[PDB]
Amino acid sequence: NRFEASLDAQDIARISLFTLESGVILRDVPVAYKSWGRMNVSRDNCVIVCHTLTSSAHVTSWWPTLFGQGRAFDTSRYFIICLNYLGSPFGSAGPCSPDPDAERPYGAKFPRTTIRDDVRIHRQVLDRLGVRQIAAVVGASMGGMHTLEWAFFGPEYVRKIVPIATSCRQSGWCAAWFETQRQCIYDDPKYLDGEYDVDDQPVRGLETARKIANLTYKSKPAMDERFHMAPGVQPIEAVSSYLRYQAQKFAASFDANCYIAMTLKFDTHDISRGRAGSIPEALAMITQPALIICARSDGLYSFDEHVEMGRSIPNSRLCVVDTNEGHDFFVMEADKVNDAVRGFLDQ
Amino acid sequence: NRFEASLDAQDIARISLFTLESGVILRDVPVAYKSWGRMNVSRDNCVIVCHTLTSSAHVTSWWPTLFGQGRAFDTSRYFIICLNYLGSPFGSAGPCSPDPDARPYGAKFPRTTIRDDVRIHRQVLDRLGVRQIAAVVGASMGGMHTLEWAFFGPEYVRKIVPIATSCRQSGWCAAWFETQRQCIYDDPKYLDGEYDVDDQPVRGLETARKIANLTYKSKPAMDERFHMAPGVGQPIEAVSSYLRYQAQKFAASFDANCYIAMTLKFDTHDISRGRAGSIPEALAMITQPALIICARSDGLYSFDEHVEMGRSIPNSRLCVVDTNEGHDFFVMEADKVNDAVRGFLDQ
Ligand SMILES: CC(C)(COP(=O)(O)OP(=O)(O)OC[C@H]1O[C@@H](n2cnc3c(N)ncnc32)[C@H](O)[C@@H]1OP(=O)(O)O)[C@@H](O)C(=O)NCCC(=O)NCCS
Ligand SMILES: CC(C)(COP(=O)(O)OP(=O)(O)OC[C@H]1O[C@@H](n2cnc3c(N)ncnc32)[C@H](O)[C@@H]1OP(=O)(O)O)[C@@H](O)C(=O)NCCC(=O)NCCS
């Protein structure tokens, strides 16, 4: 696994048997994680960070300014931990990890997993480490979906949540964007039904999926600032090169089967399913204090759906970041996100 | 030319020599057009309709309800005309048309601008005896032509109705359309534009259209079309089929080289170039009454940029259509577009 090899040092917990909510049983299941700081003696100063679609558990690599003394992820006050999702190439069980029933990696045969599956197996790891109580869960985008699912363990185990730039269930809009991206992979002749050699990826498929995803992550004003025409009496011609560079970078560093496995998780996200008759009714069962962070310019997760979260979670506050960055704001405006999270954790 | 062969009957004007603003000279140039109604004695009841990227000059095929007695394009009051852009497969000179110096132009059709189209179109109108234009109306790409028509001045062009469009290329649209072109460039059937016309880069065209289609919608419109079941096509699973159907339909009925040639026109659009030091200054030179029609939910051409048009064009009125449809609204809300256009022409 060249993806996992590329990472800084991390830990692996092995779960000998895990039942997915489908009923499919995974065996000898690795769960990768990275932690910072130290548990207090009550073992109740744990902060869980949930990562994004294509990142590893090493949150420091894209959120470096949220770590350290006086920052949100203050390793002098908290045990901070991030666990790699199932389906990911970065250490946890997925397409790139060894298949116990032949060992050969799972490849295209890695079972479907849900947001709820990840939350369940991640909690088993926290129980192994001796975590007694979680001070906060914080996650953006896909990680905000896990965050909302963590909340349902209840306020005695999970004290606070910070869902950022996210949704309560799959929407037709995001389903269509992500399926379009998968079809790019499916249509690449190198894909070979998922049977490709790991070093001969469907690179055109991955590249095109990235170009699309990148634009859905930005906004019109953000792209207009980056590329514009000269006054009538950074240039538009540069767009081509920018797109090719962004795409190639992603295609060299991610696995196609994993990209399929992980985006498919989006389609089964729904905090209400089996629990409540509607989204507002499921939200009402979230009893912890919540800080909901969003931007009006996010083109995938709307301002309105964050307002709906705020209306139905009884003890919630909505933080609207003033920015034109689009969905990518939680990384671009990391200082503002840091201050918001730190101020909420301090309360 | 199988694309041109598929159309209802239309007229062709032949321009023996045309100088593109690049300085490249086109020879023996067909310009296709379709008209409805009859000129009055003064030859001053001309209404120009400017078409969209992948349509022909036959406006009735996608705007059928704007035509007829008491409608916007009232063929009892006006001579309505639409001319096919250069670069299109539908009759005007383009990649599919005969190369007078050879075989069709193919990949070697010279670059053309919005301004080139307007120029050669006015030459045709002069041949037809049009003395004055009562209004020009166009949406999206056609709105760009519409703004360029206005520069002939208020004596030749009496009114303009730009819809869902821009004053110049933006980094946002340039990135979306360049991404779509790369899909075609990266299809192995593309062969640098030297493909056989009946062996198109179909995968590239399909993927280009899936992407375009979604940029033409909005989150609310897709979320109405496709959604999950309540907690305890229209299901999310039907998205796949929907995307494949849309894409294939387009790939069967358009030419890859022409897609390239036409989208590239977007990049050189700028009503201020050679004319003014800024967009607001160029807009201030538009002295005709203007009706600007837009939807807030348009993901490609922003509400704000239409508000800018309304602020700088001295005699303008902004019409905001109440709709959740996205860029596609001008076709989906045709009745509201009709009524706005007719009301303005009645003034
Ligand atoms: C990290 C990230 C936030 C950077 O955002 P950004 O600063 O706005 O980046 P830009 O869009 O402006 O592009 C800059 C990159 O392209 C490059 N670039 C710019 N113009 C270029 C050109 N003309 N030719 C080639 N490269 C160019 C720059 O070198 C830069 O690359 P680098 O960061 O590797 O050095 C974003 O690129 C990313 O990696 N992912 C965002 C999505 C995400 O993190 N979430 C995952 C799922 S939500
Ligand atoms: C004509 C148009 C406006 C229709 O918009 P719409 O009503 O929103 O269409 P939808 O997105 O809801 O989809 C409807 C079509 O998809 C099909 N469809 C829907 N669900 C499907 C599924 N699950 N499987 C297969 N097909 C499906 C429907 O049968 C219908 O087909 P038909 O139009 O051939 O009868 C649009 O598709 C279009 O081509 N215009 C875009 C604007 C444009 O091209 N202008 C140029 C630049 S703006």
Which of A207, A211, A226, A308 to substitute to test the interface with B, most B CBs within 10 Å? A211
Beta carbons of A208 and B186 less than 8 Å apart: yes
Q: Which two structure tokens, joined as six digits, stand for B77?
A: 């009051």
- Ligand 2 near B328 CB (within 6 A): yes
Q: What would you report as the CA-atom Rg of chain A, rounded to the nearest whole angstrom? A: 20
| Chain CA centroid to CA B269, Å | 12
Per-residue DSSP letter, B73: B
**Residues in contact with B3: Cβ distance below 8 Å, sequence separation at least 6, in sequence order:** B89, B90, B96, B253, B254, B255, B258
Measured N-to-C along each axis, helices B239-251 and B202-215 cross at an angle, to the nearest 10 degrees, of 120
Asked if residue A26 lies in contact with residue A18, where contact means CB atoms within 8 angstroms, the answer is yes
Asked if residue B297 lies in contact with residue B303, where contact means CB atoms within 8 angstroms, the answer is no
Cα-based distances in Å from B57 to A322, B31, B110 = 44, 10, 21
Indicate the resolution in Å.
2.2
Asked if residue A159 lies in contact with residue A288, where contact means CB atoms within 8 angstroms, the answer is yes
Per-residue DSSP letter, B231: -
Spacing, Cα A141 to ligand 1 middle (Å): 18
CA angle B243, B248, B253 (to 5 degrees): 135
Cα-based distances in Å from A91 to A12, A83, A103, A128, B140 = 7, 9, 17, 18, 47
* Closest B-chain CA to A300: B219
Return the bridge partners of B26, or none: B18
Q: In chain B, helix, strand, coil percent, each to 5?
A: 40, 15, 40
- Identify the nearest ligand to the CA of B221 by its number: 2
Asked if residue A324 lies in contact with residue A219, where contact means CB atoms within 8 angstroms, the answer is yes
Measure the CA–CA gap between A118 and B78, rounded to whole angstroms. 65
Asked if residue B47 lies in contact with residue B82, where contact means CB atoms within 8 angstroms, the answer is no
Which of B113, B169, B178, B300 to substitute to test the interface with A, most A CBs within 10 Å? B178
Buried-exposed string A291-305: b where 16+ CB fall within 10 A, e elsewhere: bbbbbbbbbbbbeeb
A positions 188-247 inside 8 Å of B (CB): 204, 208, 211-212, 215, 219-220, 223-229, 231-233, 236, 239-240, 242-244
Nearest CA of chain A to the CA of B291: how many Å? 24
Domain of A268, CATH number, reads 3.40.50.1820
Measure the CA–CA gap between B138 and A255, rounded to whole angstroms. 45
| The dihedral formed by the CA atoms of A321, A326, A328 and A329, expressed in degrees to the nearest 10 | -20
Measure the CA–CA gap between A256 and A234, rounded to whole angstroms. 31
Nearest by Cα to A212 from A178, A245, A249, A261? A178
**Is residue B33 classed as helix, strand or coil in its secondary structure?**
strand
Per-residue DSSP letter, B174: H
User: Helices (DSSP H) in chain B: which residue ranges?
Assistant: 2-5, 114-128, 141-149, 171-185, 202-215, 219-225, 239-251, 256-267, 279-283, 303-312, 329-332, 334-345
Largest Cα–Cα separation, chain A: 70
Asked if residue B29 lies in contact with residue B15, where contact means CB atoms within 8 angstroms, the answer is yes
Which of B182, B265, B308 to substitute to test the interface with A, most A CBs within 10 Å? B182
Nearest by Cα to A4 from A25, A26, A31? A31
Measure the CA–CA gap between A141 and A152, rounded to whole angstroms. 18
Q: Which two structure tokens, joined as six digits, stand for B100?
A: 């007078």
Cα-based distances in Å from B343 to A85, B136, B339 = 58, 14, 6
Nearest by Cα to A227 from A216, A215, A242, A213? A242
Measure the CA–CA gap between A68 and B71, rounded to whole angstroms. 67
Measure the CA–CA gap between A206 and A3, rounded to whole angstroms. 15
B249 touching chain A per CB within 8 A: no
Measure the CA–CA gap between A313 and A147, rounded to whole angstroms. 14
Beta strands B46-50; B79-83: pairing state: parallel
B positions 59-78 inside 8 Å of A (CB): none
Residue pointed to by tokens 């990680």: A143
Beta carbons of A220 and B183 less than 8 Å apart: no
DSSP for B309-341 reads HHHHSTTEEEEE---S-GGGHHHHTHHHHHHHH
Asked if residue B115 lies in contact with residue B266, where contact means CB atoms within 8 angstroms, the answer is no
- Identify the nearest ligand to the CA of B262 by its number: 2
User: Helices (DSSP H) in B237-318: which residue ranges?
Assistant: 239-251, 256-267, 279-283, 303-312
| Chain CA centroid to CA B125, Å | 19
| Ordered strands of the B11-19 beta sheet | B11-19, B25-36, B79-83, B46-50, B133-139, B160-163, B290-294, B316-320
- Ligand 1 near A328 CB (within 6 A): yes
Asked if residue B65 lies in contact with residue B338, where contact means CB atoms within 8 angstroms, the answer is yes
Half-sphere exposure of A79 (CA within 13 A, CB side): 18
**Residues in contact with B5: Cβ distance below 8 Å, sequence separation at least 6, in sequence order:** none
Beta carbons of A169 and B228 less than 8 Å apart: yes
Largest Cα–Cα separation, chain B: 70
- Ligand 2 near B140 CB (within 6 A): yes
> Is residue A88 among the annotated active site residues?
no
Q: Which own/partner contact pairs does A217-221 have at CB distance under 8 Å and 24+ positions apart? A: A217/A300, A217/A326, A217/A327, A217/A328, A218/A299, A218/A325, A218/A326, A218/A327, A218/A328, A219/A297, A219/A298, A219/A299, A219/A324, A219/A325, A219/A326, A219/B172, A220/B170, A220/B172, A220/B299, A220/B302, A221/A297, A221/A324
Please provide the size of chain B in residues.
347
Q: Which two structure tokens, joined as six digits, stand for B218?
A: 């909005």
Measure the CA–CA gap between A283 and B223, rounded to whole angstroms. 20
Facing B240 at nearest CB: one of A179, A225, A276: A179
Measure the CA–CA gap between B129 and B44, rounded to whole angstroms. 9
Can you give the residue range of the structural domain that contains B80? 1-347
Based on the structure, what is the number of domains in chain A? 1
**Is residue B193 classed as helix, strand or coil in its secondary structure?**
helix
Torsion angles phi and psi, residue B34, rounded to 5:
-140, 135
Asked if residue A91 lies in contact with residue A98, where contact means CB atoms within 8 angstroms, the answer is no
| B169 contact residues in A (CB cutoff 8 A) | 229, 236
Asked if residue B283 lies in contact with residue B312, where contact means CB atoms within 8 angstroms, the answer is yes
| Chain CA centroid to CA B100, Å | 27
Q: Which two structure tokens, joined as six digits, stand for A124?
A: 């088993």
Q: Which own/partner contact pairs does A335-342 have at CB distance under 8 Å and 24+ positions apart? A: A335/A65, A337/A66, A337/A72, A337/A140, A337/A164, A337/A293, A338/A65, A338/A66, A338/A71, A338/A72, A339/A72, A340/A291, A340/A293, A341/A66, A341/A72, A341/A138, A341/A162, A341/A291, A341/A293, A342/A70, A342/A71, A342/A72, A342/A74
Measure the CA–CA gap between A41 and A123, rounded to whole angstroms. 19
Residue pointed to by tokens 């076709």: B331
**Residues in contact with A268: Cβ distance below 8 Å, sequence separation at least 6, in sequence order:** A112, A114, A115, A170
3-state secondary structure labels for all residues of chain A:
CHHHHCCCCCEEEEEEEEECCCCCEEEEEEEEEEEECCCCCCCCCEEEEECCCCCCCCHHHCCHHHECCCCCECCCCCEEEEECCCCCCCCCCCCCCECCCCCCECHHHCCCCCHHHHHHHHHHHHHHHCCCCEEEEEEECHHHHHHHHHHHHCCCCECCEEEECCCCECCHHHHHHHHHHHHHHHHCCCCHHHCCCCCCCCHHHHHHHHHHHHHHHCCHHHHHHHCECCCCCCCHHHHHHHHHHHHHHHHHCCCHHHHHHHHHHHHCCECCCCCCCCHHHHHCCCCCCEEEEECCCCCCCCHHHHHHHHHHCCCEEEEECCCCCHHHHHHHCHHHHHHHHHHHHHC
Measure the CA–CA gap between B267 and A236, rounded to whole angstroms. 7
Half-sphere exposure of B130 (CA within 13 A, CB side): 25
Spacing, Cα A229 to ligand 1 middle (Å): 20
Number of helices (H), then strands (E), in chain B:
12, 8
Cα-based distances in Å from B243 to A81, A94, A250, B188 = 39, 28, 24, 22
**Which ligand 2 atom is at minimum distance from the Cα of B239?**
23
Q: Closest residue (by CA) to atom 12 of ligand 1?
A: A226
